[PDB]
């Protein structure tokens, strides 16, 4: 339950490469006599997998992920491999599929299991009169809520922790289908000492439980044998790869048993097996894969710097309207500059709710109300949520999801006029409280108490509808202020006032993502000297194709090239004469991938010799390969 | 701008509470003046608000029970609670929210304590 | 209604170093976070208000910024008297109450 071991040796983290394992059979599906290609999680040729040893100086056992392909290659001597410990997080919170081995039967569980830091089985007892017996059992502590047992057939499992060379190999792929976990076992006797051997294997399926769990992370159970902290294990080495869903070429005897598997997706020779759907390649030039060029960056150059909204009829407006029967204006469909009324520093009161204005320039929506009024100078605070006074509490209250800013400047000099400035009303009492975006124009007499008023003013009764009025000659609390309330939202129309910095520019030479005007996708820019017409925004050719496009901001004209890309060829020699490789990738020079360049495209592997020689291998352009000296 | 609290150290229940908060260094013209209770461990609660009209209104656990008035001339505000119980037994406390000047005051007291029970 | 998540609730801090209390609100906000300081045996007052301007007599030490949903107050050079519980206040709509609470500790 708590047990550990310290009895692990510190190695550098070397890896193992794998020329042609990892080759299993994707279905129950007899073929004979056929050369037919499958797609599955396999393992990829010519990979690196991680070294862990379980043995007397390295003993380890780590928490591996099982998402991204698990291939288990182990050599095994002295049986020291029992099981492997699968689970969603290896506790009690979820299900764990446990497969154990007790050196009679595979023990198959599937409960809530609670592992510890290191499980392992205790073979011990190993003084006098050994006889290989078991001991103790330390894989988990206790279990509940099982929901599936599996019990093999019985056999006897050699425990004796014979020394040497490895004499077997076990191969295993486990992978989740849907819930069905499928076991993949193989078996063959090799001979090596470390690593592992770089041939071919086969593997079968050998169980399918429908278990139905989650599994992300996996582990390995292993034993110890030593002729609680200080034992040591026999002679065991294992193997983890990552399985990737490549395509593979399966060869299929007059047996149905598969003897050669070739990776299409590991190099360009390779390519041309799985094109023709035949191991054995002729002299020539095939067709193999298409060449793409990936791109790097994604720049939106769509909008304009002109069309920009006219806010000087709603902040320096003649007249407004009032606090309770205002009118809410919309303006879309042009740029709004608000960055220079904050940096400006003249503003009473410059907030925005939702989206801070610093952050407005960046920042994209639908459209922006307007609600613009006169208020005094102790109602500044008053046009708040969740706040209180004469306006927030009678005339307009805002919602607690208020997206909207809150502008505010003083106005003295402004709402000053000869006369008086009357044109203005507000609502003094009200019976209830106020809702969001709701109006009252109602002139019904407040009953503040219990005694009732009779539509009369009297104790504790007053008229809801007053007016404003204000003196130069007064405190800063009894001024004019004039004020723009916005309300931002998002419809399901496109966002047309976000702010393009007020500056926009085209980088150039560069195959990377485009979004101009009329033409969305990957291209790359080169000079030009054409003249477009002040109208016009964008060119195409004769194929109605658009290659030509303009700078909204500066007089410039650039066309823009789309990227390049076309099909792989190579030069492929004789099975059983050399397996070199000569890649010509078309429609592409030899920068944006024995180098030279032809008209059909670049070709690398291939040394140019200025001596003309007989035409073997054509290509293109009078250029010809062969294989010489 | 410093406000002060101050009020008895016990009251009788079925009573009428009292408590003054004087404003110092401007008078009570332009803003909003808050009462804020706390009780004992560190747990504020909010009663209600009093605008510049005189009609107020409150939380729906304090209906008719509370009634905030204040005085232009005194430069104070009075906390008055009808039919007080065990449960108004906290910290009160005084506050100014107004604007000016092109910044946010917000100006606290020192605190009262009322101990009403049964 | 959008409530302050405190990232840390419980801060045990030297004098000299930086106090980082983050207030992940669930919704947009911008300008409506609010920085209270409420001492042990005091009244609370206003710190922070819409992240861009602090209270007038506060020092140059108590300072913040943000935007969007990340917003975290910044205290430098903080001294023995900071010893308080900082509330996140929201201004959706009333009551008027406060958050879970912040307080700081010097390390010992």
């Known amino acids: 339950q708590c047990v550990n071991l310290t009895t692990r040796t510190q190695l550098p983290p070397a890896y193992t490469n794998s020329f042609t394992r990892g080759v299993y059979y994707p279905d129950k599906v007899f073929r004979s006599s056929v050369l037919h290609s499958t797609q599955d999680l396999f393992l990829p040729f010519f990979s690196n997998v991680t070294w862990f040893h379980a043995i007397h100086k390295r003993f380890d056992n780590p928490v591996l992920p099982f998402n991204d392909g698990v291939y288990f290659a182990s050599t095994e001597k002295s049986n020291i491999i029992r099981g492997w410990i699968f689970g969603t997080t290896l506790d009690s919170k979820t299900q764990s599929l446990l497969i154990v081995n007790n050196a009679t039967n595979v023990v198959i569980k599937v409960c809530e299991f609670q592992f510890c830091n290191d499980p392992f089985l205790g073979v011990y007892y190993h003084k006098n009169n050994k006889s290989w017996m078991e001991s103790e059992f330390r894989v988990y502590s206790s279990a509940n809520n099982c929901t599936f047992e599996y019990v093999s057939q019985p056999f006897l499992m050699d425990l004796e922790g014979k020394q040497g060379n490895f004499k077997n190999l076990r191969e295993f792929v486990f992978k989740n289908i849907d819930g069905y976990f499928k076991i993949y076992s193989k078996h063959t006797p090799i001979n090596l000492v470390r690593d592992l051997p770089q041939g071919f294997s086969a593997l079968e399926p050998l169980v399918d439980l429908p278990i139905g769990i989650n599994i992300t992370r996996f582990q390995t159970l292993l034993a110890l044998h030593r002729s609680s902290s200080g034992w040591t294990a026999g002679a065991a080495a294992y193997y983890v790869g990552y399985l990737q869903p490549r395509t593979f070429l399966l060869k299929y005897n007059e047996n149905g048993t598969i003897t050669d598997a070739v990776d299409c997706a590991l190099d360009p020779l390779s390519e041309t097996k799985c094109t023709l759907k035949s191991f054995t390649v002729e002299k020539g030039i095939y067709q193999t894969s298409n060449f793409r060029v990936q791109p790097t960056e994604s720049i939106v150059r769509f909008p304009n710097i002109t069309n920009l909204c006219p806010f000087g009829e709603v902040f320096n407006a003649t007249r407004f309207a009032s606090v309770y029967a205002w009118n809410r204006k919309r303006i879309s469909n042009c740029v709004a500059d608000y960055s220079v009324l904050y940096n400006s520093a003249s503003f009473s009161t410059f907030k925005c709710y939702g989206v801070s204005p610093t952050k407005l320039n960046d920042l994209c929506f639908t459209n922006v109300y307007a609600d613009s009024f006169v208020i005094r100078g102790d109602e500044v605070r008053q046009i708040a949520p969740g706040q209180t006074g004469k306006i927030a509490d009678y005339n307009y209250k805002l919602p607690d999801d208020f997206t909207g800013c809150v502008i505010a400047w003083n106005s003295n000099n402004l709402d000053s006029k000869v006369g008086g400035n009357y044109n203005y009303l507000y609502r003094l009492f009200r019976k209830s409280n106020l809702k969001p975006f709701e109006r009252d124009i109602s002139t019904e007499i407040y009953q503040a108490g219990s005694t009732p008023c009779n539509g009369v003013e009297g104790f504790n009764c007053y008229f809801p509808l007053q007016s404003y009025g204000f003196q130069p000659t007064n405190g800063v609390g009894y001024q004019p202020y004039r004020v723009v309330v916005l309300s931002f939202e998002l419809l399901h129309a496109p966002a047309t006032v976000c702010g393009p910095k007020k500056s926009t520019n085209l980088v150039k030479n560069k195959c990377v993502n485009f979004n101009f005007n009329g033409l969305t996708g990957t291209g790359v820019l080169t000079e030009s000297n054409k003249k477009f017409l002040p109208f016009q925004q964008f060119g195409r050719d004769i194929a109605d194709t658009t290659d030509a496009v303009r700078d909204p901001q500066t007089l410039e004209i650039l066309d823009i090239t789309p990227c390049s890309f076309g099909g792989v060829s190579v030069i492929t020699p004789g099975t059983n004469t050399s397996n070199q490789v000569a890649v010509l990738y078309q429609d592409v020079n030899c920068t944006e991938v024995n180098v030279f360049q032809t008209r059909a495209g670049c070709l690398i592997g291939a040394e140019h010799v200025n001596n003309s020689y007989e035409c073997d291998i054509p290509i293109g352009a009078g250029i010809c390969a062969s294989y010489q000296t | 701008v410093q406000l002060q609290e101050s009020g008895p150290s016990l009251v009788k229940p079925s009573q009428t509470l009292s408590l003054t908060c004087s404003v110092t260094?401007?008078?009570?013209?332009?803003?909003?003046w808050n009462w804020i209770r706390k009780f004992p461990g560190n747990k504020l609660e909010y009663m209600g608000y009093i605008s510049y009209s005189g009609s107020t209104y409150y939380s729906p656990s304090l209906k008719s029970r509370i009634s905030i008035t204040r005085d232009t001339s005194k430069n104070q505000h009075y906390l008055q609670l009808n039919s007080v119980t065990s449960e108004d037994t906290a910290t009160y406390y005084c506050a100014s929210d107004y604007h000016g000047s092109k910044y946010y005051f917000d100006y606290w007291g020192q605190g009262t304590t009322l101990t009403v029970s049964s | 209604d959008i409530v302050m998540t405190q990232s840390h609730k419980f801060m045990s801090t030297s004098v000299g170093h930086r106090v980082s209390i983050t207030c992940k609100a669930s919704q947009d906000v911008g300008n409506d976070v609010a920085w209270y300081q409420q001492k042990p045996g005091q009244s609370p007052k206003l710190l922070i208000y819409?992240?861009?301007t602090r209270h007038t007599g506060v020092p140059d030490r108590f300072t913040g910024s943000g935007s969007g949903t990340d917003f975290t107050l910044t205290i430098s050079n903080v001294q023995s008297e900071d010893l308080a519980d900082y509330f996140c206040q929201q201004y959706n709509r009333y009551p008027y109450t406060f958050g879970g609470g912040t307080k700081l500790e010097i390390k010992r």
């Open positions: 819409w992240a861009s």
């Open positions: 260094g401007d008078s009570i013209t332009n803003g909003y």
